[PDB]
Design a protein around this ligand. Sequence first.
Ligand SMILES: Nc1ncnc2c1ncn2[C@@H]1O[C@H](COP(=O)(O)OP(=O)(O)O)[C@@H](O)[C@H]1O
Length: 325
Amino acid sequence: MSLQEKLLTYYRNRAAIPAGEQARAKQAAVDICAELRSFLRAKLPDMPLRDMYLSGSLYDDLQVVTADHIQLIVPLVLEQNLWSCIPGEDTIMNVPGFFLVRRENRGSSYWDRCVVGGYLSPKTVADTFEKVVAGSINWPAIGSLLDYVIRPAPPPEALTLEVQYERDKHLFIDFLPSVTLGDTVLVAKPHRLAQYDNLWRLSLRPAETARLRALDQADSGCRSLCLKILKAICKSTPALGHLTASQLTNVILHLAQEEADWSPDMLADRFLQALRGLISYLEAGVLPSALNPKVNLFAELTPEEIDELGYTLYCSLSEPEVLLQ
Ligand SMILES: Nc1ncnc2c1ncn2[C@@H]1O[C@H](COP(=O)(O)OP(=O)(O)O)[C@@H](O)[C@H]1O
């Protein structure tokens, strides 16, 4: 067996989600999203929100192995002249890709109630919606027309709803509060290290995945397929699960800037280059976002975690087949 064959087999038998399970899980999310729009509009009339919408690999057909999770973005409405955002590189935290949202001027904002010390706290905003999720046990049977049962998730996932749809099938939808100031999009997705957990996170995923799609659509290439394999590999072990979709996506994107030919027969070649690149970034302790180079996507990892990942992947260019096992 060529590495090529083993890669395609692994994708087919391990990475890929059955088209049925995949489409069905997506439709569950779509259905619930539409329901939560109507209901929460009446359940929280005072709260300045845009329409909520779905986001994540399940929505993008980049989810792997099993289809069980998706984000529901909750867009806060902010009066643009009552708030400004401060990029981390200009703060004392000095963390690019993470923002402060500072309260400004006069006026009143509904969201003043989540401001502490003159800043809109992502955690305080998150707590407003932990309340909403916990309150879901008071709601009527939403989606009961399409035989869905919505339940707050088992602790400690205080922002997650559990949706059971027939039968013994569950989809986990977490609320992801978001703010848009000018053209900067931020989400309350805590920095992995707690010190930075009250900084807002710059939303990079939509632009990352759009770039990935556009590149593959231009030439029917295999960038997405190679990515999905990596994502499923990194879901295989505890060690490798410290690697993220975003990190792997940007590994691919960087490699795409160097390699134009992503024909399906080049998959094994690209997979090794991807591993190679991944090892270099880990060696350097730096993986810059392809779309915003100022942002090091490895900056939520401790240097030891980074060294251990490097160790975990040390023999991968010469025993790659081992990752598929
Ligand atoms: N619009 C968005 N902006 C920023 N982050 C997002 C957005 N949608 C989802 N995310 C985040 O991206 C991560 C999931 O990325 P994803 O590609 O779904 O990886 P996986 O398939 O491994 O779950 C989650 O931590 C989630 O909070």
